Design an enzyme around this catalytic site. Sequence first.
Site, short mmCIF file in Angstrom:
data_model
loop_
_atom_site.label_atom_id
_atom_site.label_comp_id
_atom_site.label_asym_id
_atom_site.label_seq_id
_atom_site.Cartn_x
_atom_site.Cartn_y
_atom_site.Cartn_z
N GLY A 91 -3.62 11.68 44.71
CA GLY A 91 -4.14 10.56 45.44
C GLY A 91 -5.68 9.97 45.00
CG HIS A 151 1.01 2.14 32.66
ND1 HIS A 151 1.92 2.83 33.03
CD2 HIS A 151 0.79 2.17 31.32
CE1 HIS A 151 2.53 3.58 32.04
NE2 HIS A 151 1.96 3.03 30.77
#
Lengths: 194, 195
Positions: B11, B108
């Site tokens: 995270g 991405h």
Amino acid sequence: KRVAIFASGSGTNAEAIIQSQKAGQLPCEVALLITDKPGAKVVERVKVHEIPVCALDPKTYPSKEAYEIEVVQQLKEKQIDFVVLAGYMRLVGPTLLGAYEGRIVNIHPSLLPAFPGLHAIEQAIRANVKVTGVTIHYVDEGMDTGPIIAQEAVSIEEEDTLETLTTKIQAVEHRLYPATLHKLLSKAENLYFQ
Amino acid sequence: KRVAIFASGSGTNAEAIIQSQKAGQLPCEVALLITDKPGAKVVERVKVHEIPVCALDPKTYPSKEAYEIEVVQQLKEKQIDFVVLAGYMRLVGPTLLGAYEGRIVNIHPSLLPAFPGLHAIEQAIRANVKVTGVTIHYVDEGMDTGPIIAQEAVSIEEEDTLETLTTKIQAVEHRLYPATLHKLLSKAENLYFQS
């Protein structure tokens, strides 16, 4: 130490390579241009350096193989050690590749593997990418395939058009292709000119 | 002005977004995390800010549609205005997309359209490219498709490994995702947070 260039149309990449030899940066001599038509700026640009030009229209030949047999004949006649594609718009077939495997490089105006094939600058604009660039690579069997030697990114700004982006990409190509050829064909290794 | 983050694993992107809120740069508040596993660093990182966490294991649902129905329920429950995918490894299906079309973005670690899908940093190294980078885009139907908002190139140097390139790419992501969210969700427009 002899290089052949394959080019058409304007020949600005061929010009930058020739200029790089004149600067003392290219460790070889441009010995032949293979092109598709006599009436082009690239022919003019090359002819004034008294570099031999062989203008072969591919459609004159019965097959891609027959055309490439003549191409290889010309390269062997001029004692060519290395082949530089600079706006060559055809796929390299088995005849050409078989004779010059490992000794053919190409430049392409995208960051491969994105946007292979024709009009890659237009492809990047139509795909709405924010970053594209330039790739130089060894040529193997397929379309824009083969080990990648160098790449450089170019940002597509909001104000950029096809024209302004093409200008930016051509500026990268004119600097990068000869600088890459200098590093690749360095006199340190005797590799391609034994 | 409420954002939900979808994340798993470490995270670190979720952390950078929360940090950008704390810095005064993010014009919204992180109001929910949707995740797959309770025992992860992302849950720990988010929980300490007292942000609600919904851990939904997708495999414990009859179908992808049933899982997404619960997802949408949680987003509606928390009054979510915008959805930020930050290491969400599943395809977004028609239920999620239908409820939040135009309000889902994704990050991405390649220059799309090159190397879509999983492990894109490893893909670039295996393909022997010399330049890769990061893409932030709106999420549409499909895998890593949708209008591209921002991209940034990262060179792969000769001495780079998977580990050192991953570090470089994560550095770009931690700066670029919040900077892009700030620009996209600017107060001047107030496009996504209308009453």
